[PDB]
A paper describes a structure:
Importantly, the crystal structure for one CDCL from Elizabethkingia anophelis reveals that it exhibits a high degree of structural similarity with domains 1 to 3 (D1 to D3) of the CDCs and that the residues of the conserved F/Y-F/Y-Xn-YGR motif occupy nearly identical positions and make similar contacts in the E. anophelis CDCL crystal structure to those in PFO. The crystal structure of the E. anophelis CDCL shows that D1 to D3 are highly similar to the CDC D1 to D3 structure and D3 exhibits the characteristic αHBs of the CDCs, which refold into the TMHs of the β-barrel pore. Importantly, the position of the F/Y-F/Y-Xn-YGR motif residues and the glycine pair are nearly identical to the cognate residues in PFO. The structure of the CDCL D4, however, does not resemble the CDC D4 fold and DALI searches with the CDCL D4 structure did not reveal any similar 3D structures. The receptor-binding D4 domains of the CDCs share significant similarity in their primary, secondary, and tertiary structures, and maintain specific signature motifs, which are missing in the CDCLs. The significant diversity observed among the CDCL putative binding domains suggests they may have evolved to bind targets specific to each species. The CDCL did not form oligomers on liposomes but appeared to form stable dimers, whereas CDCLS formed SDS-resistant and heat-stable oligomers. Mixing the CDCL and CDCLS resulted in a larger SDS-resistant oligomer and exhibited higher pore-forming activity than either protein alone. Single particle analysis revealed stacked oligomeric complexes of two, and sometimes three, rings, with one exhibiting a slightly larger outer diameter than the other. The conservation of this motif and little else in the primary structures of the CDCLs and the crystal structure of the CDCL from E. anophelis strongly suggest that these residues and the αβ loop are similarly critical to their pore-forming mechanisms.
Author numbering: 34 to 59, 79 to 485, 492 to 516
The structure:
Amino acid sequence: TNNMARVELPVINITSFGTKPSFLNIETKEFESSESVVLNHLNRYVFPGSLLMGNSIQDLNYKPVFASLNPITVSLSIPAINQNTAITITNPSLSATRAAVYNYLKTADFTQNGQLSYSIQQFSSYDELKVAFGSNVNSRNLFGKNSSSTNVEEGMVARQSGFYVKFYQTSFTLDMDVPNGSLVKDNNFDSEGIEPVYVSSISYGRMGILAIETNEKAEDAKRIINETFNKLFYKKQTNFSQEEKSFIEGADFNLYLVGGDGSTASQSFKGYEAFVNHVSQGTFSKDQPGVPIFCSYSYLKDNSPVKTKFKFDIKRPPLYVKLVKENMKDINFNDPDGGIYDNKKEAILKIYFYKNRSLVPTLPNPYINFKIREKKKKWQSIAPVYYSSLDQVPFNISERILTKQNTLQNIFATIQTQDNTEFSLISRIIRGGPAGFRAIEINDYELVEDSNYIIIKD
Ligand code: NA
């Protein structure tokens, strides 16, 4: 009605844990998007010219501003068949858009599958999927991740590796010409003091965001996902390999589908049959030609593009480590209680790397330093000495700090402690020689406290 304030859209702050979208750095990262996925409950507000409260778009809590609008001219493209046609919509509204579109399509050549696209991103927090939606939508709620599993933080990838596949089929697009003058006819409308935005570009069709958690290794998961999407989604081919089918059988899949008929589907699944049902190309027709899957907005005053700003706070992935004695061999070389008792306890030391206290594996980068203390207690006597417990033995104590990295890039590492063998000496105890202690060598190995990891001692 009178003057209007431009509400600055806040920077969307995303905390991630070792992950970011592939298009970055090519810790903190700032970047921008200009397309927003249109959840299908909002489709009625997403049409060329649609006027929305300027402070209501980033959280997707669209609030329309009722106003009388001048005619608008849009380019209607079917990109799968490189067709472009200009149409003027005299009275911008949802229903003016649909009447123009449906009427054009009844006579036009169309597309069965539209223009295909997919892209893969790694992620660790479900907040990061906000990037794929191009808004501050609560992606945790959309994927069912706003509750805490016992001893695994809420909103997180639970398995080793998380990936999301944003994939969509664009049947047609609507792109406004920049208004030559005023988008609105008269400035009596009530925008509650706030400069509004209007919808200036829309892509139509169907879109999914497929969340994939898996315990396979990130490098192999990215590869398998990409190759199966290429084969199935791009090339309509179901002949997968033995490697692909088994990854599909073991991965957790969570699909958020912006259906091309207006429906919204959240589907969890597993298995090659399900994967082929949900990743196969949808099909369009003239009576179901697609619905808004993403859009872009422009400011009313100056038609300038509304930008959604993202700031990733990339934290270090959580690292839990457990020292474990494997292939334990305990040999009593003799023991007749006629002098001799010789026990040699040997094991292969392994550190296992974990994402959380539920023992989900992780693969720390090869530069993180793991420290293991070898506390050697050594004690000898020519004749056997009686101690009620080993606490009372006057050990010659000595310590080494062993340093190890995940050189071989696995979810565990063997800690070699001696030349030309993988075995560590845990204890050599000789008794009698008679029924007391003649020689005690025990190595107590324990992880050393460090800021780069949390020790699980179990
Ligand atoms: Na939608």
